[PDB]
């Protein structure tokens, strides 16, 4: 009971499918295994305790099985609601360790992005920074590669992305690539392209401007 | 039914201290162990500590001897002093209650409090534009180099929700944070209809409206 494991770190599947959280445990402990689902932006909800006894409001869909140090939940339908993140706990026992939890995501078919590239605004420029930024817009799967070149030359150490949680109506993701460089660096070149490698492109797509 | 109200956070100094208060309602304290459980910045599940009815007190290796877990009964509340704190202690802090009859069930959860430990004084973001360019158009809002977290960003305020992006801030090796919202919205509407992003970040009182104009 020292120490939660969970696997996978994520999975996907479509709409009525059947999935499967592995925890793992360290050490025996009576089999006294609690699961939480975190739904996006909210608070964790208890769904299973001892393993395998569902809590109020969650549907028969849910199960959980095992013993010993291993431990799984099954989702019997995979519907949109169930969404989540989901945790094993340890109860009963010391210490009272989570396993890193296992995040569920909606499988649909293949969506290319909409890319978009902005140049940074007159206003920031003027206090002395200037901010790239490449937008993805409504794809699928989540995996991406988002690549700058500044003048033909690939860029490293001066980006930072981040993605939205799954659109809960077309269950696509959006990413934003945001490349920042002082007022000077910015002014020194010309040519600014953010190139977009999916799963839904055959070929990469390079969004560019001309500084001016 | 069952209520768990947590206050009492905020930004801190590494060092410093902070109380966080529980109000309980819909249940009498007496009855149920109750617990503080911790999200921190991995998105990762920590019990911190637990204090029983008699006042007995327990705490996790990470906060112990730091932290100083006790309640009052009679006035359904509980509260988490936090002291010597640590860049590591920031986090979204729940008030839990364990279920009577077992230890460490967490069935019911409060709705989480954030606290962020840093040395980073609070500051106001600067707003930029970020301006569109055939059927669909893009446009947004950079929201940057603002600490602590959480921003609002709503478009037309909140008139228009359709094809609204904002994503999770990112912690900038500045250690301030930055986000962007974008929308999509139909190019033909672009130099007729009026887009504006409204920002909000309440711990600086900075408060900005930016029309985002074409080109």
């Known amino acids: 009971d020292i120490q939660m494991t969970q696997s996978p770190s994520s999975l996907s599947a479509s709409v009525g499918d059947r999935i499967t959280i592995t925890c793992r445990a360290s050490?025996?402990?009576?089999?006294?295994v609690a699961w939480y689902q975190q739904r996006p932006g909210k608070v964790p909800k208890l769904l299973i305790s001892?393993?395998?006894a569902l809590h109020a409001g969650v549907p028969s869909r849910f199960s959980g099985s095992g013993s010993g140090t291993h431990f799984t939940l099954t989702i019997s339908s995979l519907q949109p609601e169930d969404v989540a993140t989901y945790y094993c706990?340890?109860?009963?026992?010391?210490?009272?360790?989570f396993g890193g939890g296992t995040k569920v995501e909606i499988k649909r078919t293949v969506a290319a992005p909409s890319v978009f590239i902005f140049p940074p605004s007159d206003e920031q420029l003027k206090s002395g920074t200037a901010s790239v930024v490449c937008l993805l817009n409504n794809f699928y799967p989540r995996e991406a590669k988002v690549q700058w070149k500044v003048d033909n030359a690939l860029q490293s150490g001066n980006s930072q992305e981040s993605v939205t949680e799954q659109d809960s109506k077309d269950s696509t993701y959006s990413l934003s690539s945001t490349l920042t460089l002082s007022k000077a660096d910015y002014e020194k070149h010309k040519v600014y392209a953010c190139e977009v490698t999916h799963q839904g492109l055959s070929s990469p797509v390079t969004k560019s401007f001309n500084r001016g | 039914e069952v209520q768990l109200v947590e206050s009492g956070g905020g930004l801190i100094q590494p060092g410093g201290s902070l109380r966080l208060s529980c109000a309980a309602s819909?249940?009498?304290?007496?009855?149920?162990?109750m617990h503080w459980v911790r999200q921190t910045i991995d998105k990762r599940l920590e019990w911190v500590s637990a204090?029983?009815?008699?006042?007995?007190?327990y705490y996790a290796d990470s906060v112990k001897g730091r932290f100083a877990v006790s309640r009052e009964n009679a006035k359904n509340s509980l509260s988490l002093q936090m002291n010597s704190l640590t860049a590591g202690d920031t986090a979204i802090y729940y008030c839990?209650?364990?279920?009577?009859?077992?230890?460490?069930?967490?069935?019911?959860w409060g709705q989480g409090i954030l606290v962020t430990v840093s040395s980073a004084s609070t500051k106001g973001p600067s707003v930029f534009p970020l301006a569109p360019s055939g059927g669909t158009a893009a446009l947004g809002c950079l929201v940057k180099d603002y600490f602590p977290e959480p921003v609002t960003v709503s478009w037309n305020s909140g008139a228009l929700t359709s094809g609204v992006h904002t994503f999770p801030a990112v912690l900038q090796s500045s250690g301030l944070y930055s986000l962007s919202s974008v929308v999509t919205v139909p190019s033909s509407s672009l130099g007729t209809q009026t887009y504006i992003c409204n920002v909000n970040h309440k711990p600086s009182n900075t408060k900005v409206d930016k029309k985002v104009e074409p080109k």
């Open positions: 839990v209650r364990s279920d009577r009859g077992v230890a460490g069930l967490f069935d019911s």
């Open positions: 819909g249940f009498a304290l007496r009855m149920y162990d």
């Open positions: 204090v029983g009815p008699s006042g007995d007190t």
């Open positions: 050490q025996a402990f009576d089999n006294y």
């Open positions: 001892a393993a395998s």
């Open positions: 706990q340890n109860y009963n026992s010391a210490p009272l360790t």
